Amino acid sequence: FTMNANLYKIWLILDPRRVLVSIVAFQIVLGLLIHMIVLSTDLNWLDDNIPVSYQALGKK
Amino acid sequence: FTMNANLYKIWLILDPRRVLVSIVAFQIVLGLLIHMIVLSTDLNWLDDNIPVSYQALGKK
Amino acid sequence: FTMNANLYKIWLILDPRRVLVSIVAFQIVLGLLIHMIVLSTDLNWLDDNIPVSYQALGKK
Amino acid sequence: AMLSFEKKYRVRGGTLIGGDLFDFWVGPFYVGFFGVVGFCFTLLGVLLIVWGATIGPTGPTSDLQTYNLWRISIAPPDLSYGLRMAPLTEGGLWQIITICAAGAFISWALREVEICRKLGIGFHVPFAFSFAIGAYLVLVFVRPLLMGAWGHGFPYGILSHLDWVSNVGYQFLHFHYNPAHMLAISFFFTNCLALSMHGSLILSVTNPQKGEPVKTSEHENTFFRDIVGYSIGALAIHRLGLFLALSAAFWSAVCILISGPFWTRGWPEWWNWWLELPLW
Amino acid sequence: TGLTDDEAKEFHAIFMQSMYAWFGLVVIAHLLAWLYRPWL
Amino acid sequence: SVMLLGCEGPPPGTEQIGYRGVGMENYYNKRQRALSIQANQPVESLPAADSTGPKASEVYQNVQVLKDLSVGEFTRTMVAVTTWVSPKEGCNYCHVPGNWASDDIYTKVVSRRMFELVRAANSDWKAHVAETGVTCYTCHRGNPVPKYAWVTDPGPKYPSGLKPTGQNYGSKTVAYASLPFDPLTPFLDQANEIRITGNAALAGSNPASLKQAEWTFGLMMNISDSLGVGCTFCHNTRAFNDWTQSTPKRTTAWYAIRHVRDINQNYIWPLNDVLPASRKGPYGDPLRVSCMTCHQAVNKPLYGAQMAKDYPGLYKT
Amino acid sequence: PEYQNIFTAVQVRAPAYPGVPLPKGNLPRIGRPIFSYWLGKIGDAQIGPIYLGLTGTLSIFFGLVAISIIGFNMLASVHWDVFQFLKHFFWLGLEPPPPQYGLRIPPLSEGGWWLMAGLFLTLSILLWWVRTYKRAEALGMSQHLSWAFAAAIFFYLVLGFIRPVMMGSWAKAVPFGIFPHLDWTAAFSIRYGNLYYNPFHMLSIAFLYGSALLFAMHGATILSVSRFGGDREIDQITHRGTAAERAALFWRWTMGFNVTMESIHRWAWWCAVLTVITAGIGILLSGTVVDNWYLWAVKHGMAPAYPEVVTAVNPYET
Amino acid sequence: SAGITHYIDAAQITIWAFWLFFFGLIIYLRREDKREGYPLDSDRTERSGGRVKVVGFPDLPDPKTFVLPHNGGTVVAPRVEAPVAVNATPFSPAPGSPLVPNGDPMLSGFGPAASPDRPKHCDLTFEGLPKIVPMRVAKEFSIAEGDPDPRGMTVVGLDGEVAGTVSDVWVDRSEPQIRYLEVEVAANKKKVLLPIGFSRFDKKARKVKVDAIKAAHFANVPTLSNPDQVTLYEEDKVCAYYAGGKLYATAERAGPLL
Ligand code: BCL
Ligand code: BCL
Ligand code: BCL
Ligand code: BCL
Ligand SMILES: CC[C@H]1c2cc3[nH]c4c(c3C)C(=O)[C@H](C(=O)OC)c4c3nc(cc4[nH]c(cc(n2)[C@@H]1C)c(C(C)=O)c4C)[C@@H](C)[C@@H]3CCC(=O)OC/C=C(\C)CCC[C@H](C)CCC[C@H](C)CCCC(C)C
Ligand SMILES: CC[C@H]1c2cc3[nH]c4c(c3C)C(=O)[C@H](C(=O)OC)c4c3nc(cc4[nH]c(cc(n2)[C@@H]1C)c(C(C)=O)c4C)[C@@H](C)[C@@H]3CCC(=O)OC/C=C(\C)CCC[C@H](C)CCC[C@H](C)CCCC(C)C
Ligand SMILES: CC(C)=CCC/C(C)=C/CC/C(C)=C\CC/C(C)=C\CC/C(C)=C/CC/C(C)=C/CC/C(C)=C/CC/C(C)=C/CC1=C(C)C(=O)c2ccccc2C1=O
Ligand SMILES: COC1=C(OC)C(=O)C(C/C=C(\C)CC/C=C(\C)CC/C=C(\C)CC/C=C(\C)CC/C=C(\C)CC/C=C(\C)CC/C=C(\C)CCC=C(C)C)=C(C)C1=O
Ligand SMILES: COC(C)(C)C/C=C/C(C)=C/C=C/C(C)=C/C=C/C(C)=C/C=C\C=C(C)\C=C\C=C(C)\C=C\C=C(C)\C=C\CC(C)(C)OC
Ligand code: HEM
Ligand code: HEM
Ligand SMILES: [Ba+2]
Ligand SMILES: [Ba+2]
Ligand SMILES: [Ba+2]
Ligand SMILES: [Ba+2]
Ligand SMILES: [Ba+2]
Ligand SMILES: [Fe+3]
C-alpha cells in the first residue's frame, strides 16, 4: 500500500515546523553517525594508502 | 483481519498525537539498537575487508 | 471474561489511561529485559555460528 | 557592643536551661547556660591540645615533640585498648579532648537554639549545624564503636589527620569507587555550583551596569530561564543550597560509615553486583 | 481525548493501514535478509 | 531498585598496622575468614620415610632431578606428587603405563621441570618464601591445571577502525577497577618499570608518565587482591615510594615480583612447545604464574601452613 | 510545630511569563512553557521558555558533537554490543593520545577522537561562557556569573589543556569516563607524590568545604527568616527589614560578628570562585614546578614524624 | 656548580601571593559587612557623649547608592539612621543585660516582636504594579490543580481555638506563589494578613494552623492602610507581631525548661 486517500490529514495532526525540523535533525544525525561507523570499520576510505602515497618514505 | 470493531474507540482514551510521535521514537530506538546488536555479532557486514582489501590493498 | 463477579468496577478505582500506558511501558521493558537475559546466557541465538559460519564466510 | 538596630531585640528569656542565671550578653556574643558550658569544654579542650603539643609523642625533649603548627598531633590509643579509657599519655588525652570537642559542639548548637528562641527565627541553622556534628560523631564515636575500639578515630592534627584520611581511604584500594563517596562528592560539588550561581545572581542584580536601576524578581527569573530554561526561583535556591550542603555532609557520613563495619573488601569490587546481573 | 466518535474511526482506519503497510515493508526487508543470509 | 546491594554486617575483624592515628589499618569479614581458612587447608604429610638406602639414581632409569633421594623417600615423593597434582587420575597421569622410566608423555617432561621449579623456589627464594616454602599443592590443589593460572588477554572486541583502550573495562583482574586489565604481562612476565614517584620534590629529573602511574596502580591492585590485603599491608600511603615507612612485607613483595619473573620466564614459557592447545591463550601464550596462583587470596598460601619441610626432595642438592 | 518552607504546601499559577524584554538584536525566544506540579512542590514550576542565539546554537552544536565522539567511541570499545555498553558503561571511556605522539594530532584509532572531543568540548564550553554574558547584558545586569564561570573554565582548561601542553603531552589531560576519570584523579595524586601536601589543593579543599559551609549557613538563615520574606533578598538589600536584621543578629550573637544581606553573597561568591581558583593553581604546579608534594612539604618542614614503629629495608639498596 | 638548590621555589612564593590577596580580600568583605548596623552601640559612645563612635577594624566604606527602579528613590549604605527608643527597660543597669518588654509583650514591638520602619510604599512588579496583592486584585492567579484551595479553610491559633477563616489569598505577581493568607477574623470580622511562613496546613481537615499566636491575638494583627495592596512597612509590622508569639504568646515560651 502506497499512500492514504487522506494522508495529508497527518498535518492537521502534526506541526509542519516540528516535523520538518525533526527530520532535519534526525537526518543530519544519522548521516554523521553512519559516517563515523563506516570510518571505524573496513569501509574506511581514507587510511587506505591509495591512490598515490602521500607520506613519502616512512615516518610522519 | 482478526480484530475488534470498537477498536477505533481507543483513540478516545489515548491521545493520538502522543501515540504517533512515540511510535516513531521507539522504532528509531529499536532500529538503531538491533542494528548495533547485529553489527556486534557474526552477521556483521563491515569488519572483514571485502571485496577489495581496503585496509590492505594499499596498506598491509 | 473477567477475574469473576464484577471486574469492571476495577475501573472505578484505577484510571484506564494510566493502566494502559503503564502496561505498554512495562511490557516493552520486560521484553527488552528478557531478550537481554537470554542472549546473556547459554540460550543465545546470535553469536553461535549457527546455522553456518559467517565471519569465516568472510575468511575461507 | 550592639549593631545600630540591635537594642530593640535584646529581650530576656528563651533559654532551654538556666533562665536569668546566665541570661546575659558579653560584647557581641550571647552567653546563656550552654555558652558557659561550651566555653568550659572548649577552653579545657584547647588548653589540653596545648599540653599535647607541649609533651610530644615521646616526651618534651624528644625530636618528635613539637610546637610547629603543621606537625603537632594528638592521636588515639592503639586498638589493643578497645573501648576502654586508655592512659592519658597513650591516647587518653585524645579521648578527653574529643569529649570536650563533642560537648562544645553540642553546646554551641544548643546555644544557637536559645538564640533562635530569643530572636523568633526558625531553627534551621542549628539543625543544619547538627549535620556537621553528626559527621564529626561518626568520625570519632559511631564508626570506632561499631569497630570495637576508639582508636579507629582520626587524630587531631593539621596534617596527621590528612594522613589518617589517606591511609584509611587507601585500605580499600580505590576509594573513589565508593558509591556513597561518589554521591557525597557530587553534592559537595553541586553545592559549590549553586552557591556560585546564587552569589553571582544576587550580586548581578542588586548592582547592575551604571545607568541601570536595582534589578527585579522578574530579571532574576528571566536570566537563568534565558540561559538554561529554568529558574528554580529565589526562595527555593535557598532551599536547594541547604539541601545540597546538608546532603553532602550526610553522604559523607554514610560513605565513611560503610567503610569498615559494613564493607571490608576493596571498594571497586562492590560494583560487582553490576557486572554480574543476569542481563549480561 | 476531546475527540468525537467519528474522528477516531477515521484516524483508526488510517493508522491501521499505515501500520500494516509498515509491517509489510518489514516482512519485505526480513525476507531479503533471509534470502541473502539465512539466520535460523 | 536500583537494588541495595552489597554489604557486610558489623563488627569487622580489625588489625592495627602502623602507629596509632596514622590510619594504617585493615578490616575483614570474620565469616569469610573462617571459610577461607577452611578452603585453604593443607594436605597432611605422608609418614617420613626411613632409609638409609641406595640413591634413587642408582635404581631407576631416567632420574634427572630427584637423584640423591633414597628409594623409599623417592617413592614417598612420588605418592605426594600424585595426590598433589593429579589424584583423580593417579600415577598414569604423568607416566607411560608399564614404563616408569619413559618421558614419552609431556606431563612428565613438565613434571620434571616443575620439580626443578619447586626445588629452586624453596632453596633460593627464602627472602620471599621464608621457612614455609612451596609445594606442588600450592598451585595445583588436587588439580592438573592450577585453577588460578593466567594468560595474556586481548580485552573485549574493537572494530578494525580503532585500537584497544588498554585500560577502561570491567575487569576482575584489576580488582574490578577500570585501570589497565593486564597489568601482569608487563610486570609479572616481562620486567617493565613499576616506579613513577620522583625522589626530588621539584621537577626536571623524573620522566615517569601519568600513564605509567596508572599501570603501576593497576598492577598494584592486582597484587593487593591476590594476596588479599590493602596497601597498608606494605605501605604508608603518604609515601608509597618511601621505603622506611613501608612494612617488611614491601620488602618481601619486592623479592616476590622477581621470583614470578623467574617462574614465568625460565620454567613456564619454555614448556610452551610440548603443551597442547587446550593449555594456551589466543596469542599462543601459555597459562603461567602470578601471585594469585599460589596465594589464592591469602597473605601466606594456606594461611602460612608449612608443607615443604616434610619433603627433603623439594630442596636443592 | 511551624512550616519550614521546604515544600510549597499549596501552589498558584498564572499564565507563563515569557520574561523581561530584550532589546533589538537579542533574537526571539523559543519553546512554549509547561508546569511541573512536582518542581512546583519545591520551586518555580515554570519550565522555560529558553533563548537560543547564534552563540547558544553554535554551542549546543559543538557540545553535542563532543558528546557523540565520546559515546560512539565507548560503544565501539565493547564492539557495538549495546548490552555490553550498558554493562561496562561506568568503566567505558575514551583514552587520550598516547605519549609516543606528544602534542601532534594523532590517528583516529589512537586518540585523535579524544583530541576532537576535547577541542569541540572546550569550544562549546567557552561559547556557553559568551552565551551567559550576552544573556546577562540584555538585562542590564552585571557579569558576576561570567567571572565565576570564567574561574571554573580556568580550572577545566588547566586540567585538560594548559598542563598537558606545558608538560608536552596530550596523554596528561583527563580521559572521558566516570570511573576512568576517577582513576585519572587517583593516578594523578600518586604520580606527583601525594597531592595532600600540595598547599593549593589544601586551600581549594578549604574552599569546597567552605562552599558547603557558607551555603549551608546562609541557606539555613534565609529559610529561618523566610517568615519575614527574607528570601526576597533584593528588597531586604535595598530596604533592610527585620528579616535581614534577625538574620544578621543570629550570627552576631553566636560567633561575634556578622555580615549583611548583601555582603553574605559576596562571601559566598568569593568562596566558590576560590575553590576552582586554588584548584587550578594546584594542578598548574603539578609536574611543571613541583614533582613530589610530600617532598615539597618536607622541604618546608610541614610533614609530621611519627615514631617509626614499622619499617621495610630497601631491596634496591642490597 | 650546576646544582645550587634554591630554597625558594615557585610554590612558596605563590602561596605567599595567595595569602596577601587573601588578607586584602578578608578586609574588604569585612568592610562590606558594615554597610548596615554600624557604627555600633556601646555605653562607650554615650559615656563620651559621642566622641567615640564604635566601628572597629577595618573601617566603614564610602556610601554606595542604590537607584530604585520606578521613581522609587535612592538608597545609601552606610547611612545615618535616627536613633529609636527601646520599648523596654534594662533587666539590669549593668552592661550586657537584656531588657524586659514594656507592657503586653505582644504589643511591645520589642524582642521577637520588634521590627524596623521599611518604606510606606509597595514593592513592585517589573511593570510597576503592586507586587504582593490579593488574588482578588490579581484576577489571573489560580490554585494549582490538586491543591486544596486555602480560600475557606479555618484559621486556628496555637491553643486549638478558631481565629477566623481564610477570606482570600495574597500572591506574588513577580514570582507566582502564596505569600500571604488573609484572615477574616472571627472575633471582630476585621481583615488581617498571616504570613505563609507562620501557617501550617491540615488539608484533610481544611484547616490552617498557627503555633505562633493564640486565636485571640489575631485580633491585634497590625493593619493595612489599604486592603488591595500592602507596603514594605506593613509587611514587617505584620510578620514581627506573629513572631512575638514565639516568645510571648504563652507564659512558657519564655524558657527555662529546667
Ligand atoms: C584518601 C583516599 C580517598 C579518600 C578517602 C576519604 C576518607 C577515608 C574520607 C573521605 C572523606 C570525604 N571525602 Mg574523600 N577520599 C578521596 C578523594 C576525594 C575527593 C576527590 C576529588 O577525589 C573528594 C572531593 C573527596 C571528598 C570527600 C568528602 C565527600 C568527605 C568529607 C566530608 C566531611 O568531612 O564532612 C563532615 C564535616 C565535619 C565532620 C566537620 C564537623 C564540624 C564540627 C562539628 C565543628 C568543628 C569545629 C571546629 C572546632 C572548627 C575549628 C574552628 C576554630 C575553633 C576557630 N574525597 C581519596 C580517593 N575521603 C571523609 C568522609 O567520608 O566523610 C566523613 C572520610 O572519612
Ligand atoms: C542486519 C543486516 C542488514 C540489515 C537488514 C535490515 C532488515 C531486516 C531491516 C532493516 C531495516 C532498516 N535498516 Mg537495515 N540492514 C543492514 C544495513 C543497513 C544500513 C547500513 C549503513 O548499512 C542502514 C542505514 C540501514 C537502515 C535501516 C533503516 C532504514 C530501516 C528501519 C527503519 C526504522 O527503523 O525506522 C522505524 C520507522 C519509523 C520511525 C516510522 C516509519 C515512517 C512513518 C510511519 C511515517 C509517518 C510519518 C511520521 C509520523 C513523520 C516522520 C518523521 C519521523 C522523524 C521519521 N540498514 C544490514 C546489512 N535492515 C528495516 C526496514 O527495512 O524496514 C522494513 C528492517 O526490517
Ligand atoms: C573530612 C575528613 C577529615 C578532614 C579532611 C580535611 C582535608 C582533606 C583537609 C582538611 C583541612 C583542614 N581541616 Mg579537616 N577533616 C576532617 C575533620 C576536621 C575537623 C573536625 C574536628 O571534625 C576539623 C576541626 C578540621 C579542620 C581542618 C583545618 C585543620 C583545615 C582547614 C579547614 C577548612 O578550611 O575547612 C573549611 C572550614 C572553614 C573555612 C571554617 C574556618 C575554620 C578553620 C579553617 C578551622 C580551624 C582549625 C584550627 C586551625 C585547628 C582546630 C582548632 C584547634 C582546636 C584550636 N577537619 C576529617 C577528619 N580537612 C584542609 C587543610 O588544609 O588541612 C591541611 C584539607 O586539605
Ligand atoms: C584522589 C587522590 C587525592 C585527590 C586528588 C585530586 C586531584 C588530582 C584533584 C583534586 C581536586 C579537588 N579535590 Mg581532591 N584528592 C583527594 C582527596 C580529597 C578530599 C578529601 C576529603 O580527602 C577532598 C575534599 C578533595 C577535594 C577536592 C576539590 C576541593 C578539588 C577541586 C574541586 C572541583 O570541583 O573541581 C572540579 C570543577 C571543575 C573541573 C570545573 C567544571 C567546569 C566544567 C567546564 C564543566 C563542564 C561541564 C560539561 C561541559 C557538561 C557536559 C559534560 C561532558 C560529558 C563532559 N580531595 C586525594 C588526596 N583532588 C582538584 C585539585 O585540587 O587540584 C589541585 C584536582 O584536579
Ligand atoms: C553539615 C553541612 C556543613 C556544615 C554545617 C554547619 N557547620 C556549622 C554550622 C552549620 C549549619 C553552624 O551554625 C556552626 C557555626 O557556628 O557557623 C560558623 C558551624 C560550625 N562550623 C564550623 C566548622 C566546620 N564545619 C564544617 C563542615 C560542615 N558544616 C558541612 C560542610 C567543617 C569541615 C571539616 O569542613 C568545619 C571545620 C565551626 C566554625 C562552627 C562550629 C564551631 C563551634 O561549635 O564552636 C565550639 C567549639 C569550639 C570553639 C572548639 C572546641 C575545642 C575542642 C575541645 C578542641 C577541638 C578538637 C578537635 C576535635 C581537633 C581537630 C583538630 C584539627 C586540626 C583536625
Ligand atoms: C566556582 C566554580 C563552580 C562552577 C561555576 C559555574 N559552573 C557553570 C557556570 C558557573 C559560574 C556557568 O555559568 C555555567 C552554567 O550554565 O550554569 C548553569 C556552568 C556550567 N557548569 C556545568 C557543569 C559543571 N560545572 C562544574 C563545576 C563548577 N562550576 C564549580 C563547582 C561541574 C563539576 C566539576 O562537577 C560540572 C559538571 C554546566 C551545567 C555549565 C556549562 C555547560 C556547557 O558548557 O555547555 C556546553 C555544551 C553542551 C553541554 C551541549 C548541550 C547538551 C544539551 C543538554 C543537549 C540538548 C539537545 C537539544 C534538545 C537540541 C537537539 C539537538 C540537535 C543537535 C538535534
Ligand atoms: C581564659 C579565658 C577567660 C578566656 C579569655 C577569652 C579570650 C581568649 C577572648 C578573645 C576574644 C576573641 C578574639 C576570640 C573569641 C573566639 C571565639 C569564642 C571563637 C570564634 C567562634 C567562631 C564560630 C568563629 C568562626 C569564624 C569563621 C570564619 C566561621 C565561618 C563562617 C564565616 C565564613 C563567617 C563570616 C560570614 C558570616 C558571619 C555570615 C553569617 C550570615 C549569614 C550566613 C547570612 O546568611 C546572613 C543573611 C542576612 C544578613 C546577615 C547574614 C549573616 O551575617
Ligand atoms: C536569587 O535566586 C535564584 C533563583 O531565583 C530566582 C534561581 O532561579 C536560580 C537558578 C537556579 C537553578 C537553575 C538551580 C540549579 C540547580 C542545579 C543545577 C542542581 C542539580 C541538581 C540535580 C540535577 C538533582 C539532584 C537531586 C536528586 C536527583 C534527588 C535525589 C534523592 C536522593 C539521593 C535521596 C534523598 C535522601 C537523602 C539525600 C538523605 C538525607 C538528606 C537530608 C536529610 C537533606 C535535608 C534537606 C532539606 C532541604 C531540609 C539561582 C541561582 C538563584 O540564585
Ligand atoms: C551510543 O551513544 C550515542 C548517543 C552516540 C552517544 C552517547 C554519548 C555518551 C553517552 C557519552 C558519555 C560521555 C561521558 C559520560 C563523558 C564523561 C566525561 C568525563 C567524566 C570527563 C572528566 C574530565 C574531562 C576533562 C577535564 C577533559 C578535558 C579536556 C580538555 C580540556 C581538552 C582540551 C582540548 C582542546 C582545547 C583541543 C585543542 C585542539 C587544538 C586546536 C590544540 O588542536 C590543534
Ligand atoms: C604413585 C604414583 C607414582 C609412582 C609409583 C611413580 C613412580 C616413579 C618411579 C618409580 C620413577 C623412577 C622411574 C624412572 O626414572 O625410571 C618416577 C620418575 C618420575 N616421575 Fe614419577 N610416579 C608416580 C607419580 C608421578 C606423578 C603424579 C608425577 C607428576 C606429577 C610424576 C613425575 C615423575 C617424573 C618427572 C619423573 C622423572 C623424575 C626426575 O627426573 O627426577 N610421577 N616415578
Ligand atoms: C591499590 C593500592 C596500591 C597502590 C595504589 C600502590 C601503589 C604503588 C606505587 C605507586 C608504587 C611505586 C612507588 C614508586 O614509584 O617508588 C608501588 C610500589 C610497590 N608496591 Fe605498591 N600499591 C598498592 C598496594 C601494594 C601491595 C598490597 C603491595 C605488597 C603486596 C605493594 C608492594 C609494592 C612494592 C614491593 C613496591 C616496590 C616495587 C618496585 O620498586 O619495583 N603495593 N606501589
Ligand atoms: Ba601526507
Ligand atoms: Ba579501506
Ligand atoms: Ba561477515
Ligand atoms: Ba553471566
Ligand atoms: Ba580488608
Ligand atoms: Fe541568598
UniProtKB/Swiss-Prot annotation, chain F:
| Binding-site list for heme 2 | M114, C136, C139, H140
What processing steps or modifications follow its translation?
A: Binds 4 heme groups per subunit.
Task: Output the Gene Ontology terms for molecular function.
Answer: electron transfer activity; heme binding; iron ion binding
Q: Which GO terms describe its biological process?
A: photosynthesis; photosynthesis, light reaction
Q: What does this protein do?
A: The reaction center of purple bacteria contains a tightly bound cytochrome molecule which re-reduces the photo oxidized primary electron donor.
Q: How does it sit in the membrane?
A: Lipid-anchor
Q: Where does heme 3 bind?
A: M220, C231, C234, H235
- Name of the protein in its database record: Photosynthetic reaction center cytochrome c subunit
Instruction: Describe the subunit structure.
Output: Component of the photosynthetic reaction center composed of protein subunits L (PufL), M (PufM), H (PuhA) and cytochrome C (PufC). The reaction center interacts with light-harvesting antenna complex LH1.
Q: Which gene encodes it?
A: pufC
Residues the entry annotates as binding heme 1: M78, C91, C94, H95
N-palmitoyl cysteine-type lipidated residues: C7
Which keywords has UniProt assigned to this entry?
Answer: Electron transport, Heme, Iron, Lipoprotein, Membrane, Metal-binding, Palmitate, Photosynthesis, Reaction center, Signal, Transport
* Lipid-modified residues, S-diacylglycerol cysteine kind: C7
Q: Where does heme 4 bind?
A: H128, C291, C294, H295
Give any Gene Ontology cellular component. Answer: plasma membrane light-harvesting complex
Location within or outside the cell: Cellular chromatophore membrane
